[PDB]
Amino acid sequence: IPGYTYGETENRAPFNLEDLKLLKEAVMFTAEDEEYIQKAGEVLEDQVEEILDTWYGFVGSHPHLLYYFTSPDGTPNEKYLAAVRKRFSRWILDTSNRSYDQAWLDYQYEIGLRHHRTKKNQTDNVESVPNIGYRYLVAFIYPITATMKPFLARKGHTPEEVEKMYQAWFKATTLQVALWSYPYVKYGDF
Amino acid sequence: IPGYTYGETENRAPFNLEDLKLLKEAVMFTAEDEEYIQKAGEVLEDQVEEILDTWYGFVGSHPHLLYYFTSPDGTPNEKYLAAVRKRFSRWILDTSNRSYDQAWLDYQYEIGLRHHRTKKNQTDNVESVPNIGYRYLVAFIYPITATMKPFLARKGHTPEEVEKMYQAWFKATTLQVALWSYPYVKYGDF
Ligand code: HEM
Ligand code: HEM
Structure with missing residues (x-):
């Protein structure tokens, strides 16, 4: 997957497992969620192409969002979209x-850098x-969760179990972000 | 309510209604959510004392979260907690x-300033x-929604109505944040 450098990045993150422990606590994330996030993965894995179509469909419906993938002439850079899409899928x-x-x-730090001016547009040249204005990274927590919700019900677990996969995805x-x-x-200030 | 200055703020927000419209689109907020957020606070009005109790109970039970309400010697400032609680209630x-x-x-800009080193600890002197490290403001999107969830069902609405009020709360x-x-x-970079 071009541009995908998980586990082999150039930098160690500026946060460590103690920072992560404390942040998991803030988001109510526990060993129960670890289990249900894996089950979410099992449910979502064969639906990935439809997920991506749904996700990029949302991004493409709003010009000020599609904007972040645009060439200077205001049109979508289709090379950029395609390359990113493979990394989003992963x-x-x-x-x-x-x-x-x-x-x-370490890869969480790398993904942040890539949305930020620090490394944006460098991975795909x-x-x-x-x-990408930070305001929309926070905003997107919601549609990411709303996008995944329908797909978690299609395979075909109880409302109680779907709710647990959904809640784990939301926390994660x-x-x-x-x-x-x-x-x-x-x-x-972080 | 001491320190509550809604509609009476010193400054105008660096963001406007056009920014708000674009941000609403990014969080999938529509006229349909206005209706259910209104309903949400019709449901939640009666239960605010119990919500506050649950909320500050979560904050209180994690030393690194309670931290943000502590005096320099490390002990929780009870005056600070009780005053802020009145504004959170509102x-x-x-x-x-x-x-x-x-x-x-405009009040949104004020709330962000109060969490940040710009105005933290001034309102209550x-x-x-x-x-408050920004990592936790994002993190708290989760527990805030989780806290409201049970209370939204207790006034006897249908499961689709509860869901709609919850999703509106999550968006809002x-x-x-x-x-x-x-x-x-x-x-x-915003
Ligand atoms: C919950 C928030 C978000 C999630 C979960 C998310 C997910 C991702 C992922 C997984 C990647 C690929 C990372 C890699 O290189 O391995 C990526 C890159 C990218 N995302 Fe996001 N994203 C979010 C917010 C946003 C927003 C608000 C936009 C604006 C439309 C956006 C647009 C982009 C763009 C343009 C890239 C390519 C950046 C680059 O040049 O490297 N993302 N995103
Ligand atoms: C979803 C995220 C959050 C929400 C919805 C929220 C809500 C609020 C509200 C409504 C106020 C009072 C605003 C006013 O003055 O009228 C406030 C203040 C405050 N909150 Fe939060 N808050 C969030 C994140 C956090 C976090 C992570 C902490 C860490 C414990 C925290 C602790 C405090 C403190 C210490 C104040 C008083 C700040 C000051 O000195 O003015 N909040 N919050």
Whole structure:
């Protein structure tokens, strides 16, 4: 997967497992969620192409969102979209299947950097907008969860079990966006 | 309510109603959510004392969270806790009842400043930790929604109605924390 460097990044994250422990506590994430996030992964894995179509369909319906994938002429850079899409697809699996350990934290730092002006447009060597306003990274916690919700019911568990996979995904997505804030936030304010 | 200055803030927010419309789109908030957030705060009005108890009970049971309300010697400042609790109580109603317009936006900027080192500890004239690390503001999107969830069902609405009130609360909470990122974010990166 071009551009995908999980576990082999150039930098160690500026946060460690003790930071992660304390943030899991803030998001109410426990060993029970670890179990249900894996089950979410099992439910979602064969539905990935439909998930991506649904996700990028949302992004594409709003010009000020599609904007972050645009060439200077205001049109979508289709090379950029395609390349990112393969890494997003793998992130769905990573969220479900990776241990949230130090290597995981290292890639969380890398993903933040990539949304931020620090590294945006460098992975795919494209000309696009320099920065994704942090306001929308936070905003997107909601649609990520709303996108996944229908797919978690299709395979075909009880409302009680679906709710647990959904709640685990919500906690896991919030935790990640919190980490991704690091390069956006004024030094010492994170 | 001491320190509560809604509609009476010193400054205008660096964001406007056009920003708010674009952020609402990013969190999938529509006229349909206005109706159910209104209903939510009709359901929640009666139960605010129990909600506050549950909420500060979560904060209180994690030393690194209770931390943010502590005096320099490490002990919780009870004056600070009781005063802020009155404004948080009002915020529950404001989220449900206020029209999200320019004056609401203005109070959003104020709330973010109060969590940040810019205005933390001034409203109540207390001496406490200087800054709430932004990682936890994002993290708290989760427990805030989890706390409201049980209370939204207790007035005997249908499961689809409860779900709709919850999803509206989730959208609205996410929208607010995105706006509160303003004083935390590197100038120009928001
Ligand atoms: C909950 C919030 C979000 C999640 C879970 C998410 C997910 C991801 C993932 C997994 C990648 C690939 C990372 C890699 O390189 O391995 C990525 C990159 C990217 N995302 Fe997001 N994203 C979020 C917020 C946003 C927002 C608000 C936008 C704006 C439309 C956006 C647009 C992009 C763009 C343009 C890239 C390519 C950045 C680059 O040049 O490297 N993302 N995103
Ligand atoms: C979803 C995220 C959060 C929400 C919805 C929220 C809600 C609120 C509200 C409504 C207020 C009072 C605003 C006013 O003055 O009218 C407040 C203040 C405060 N909150 Fe939060 N809060 C969040 C994140 C956090 C976090 C992570 C902490 C860490 C414990 C925290 C602790 C405090 C403190 C210490 C104050 C007083 C700040 C000051 O000195 O003015 N909050 N919060």
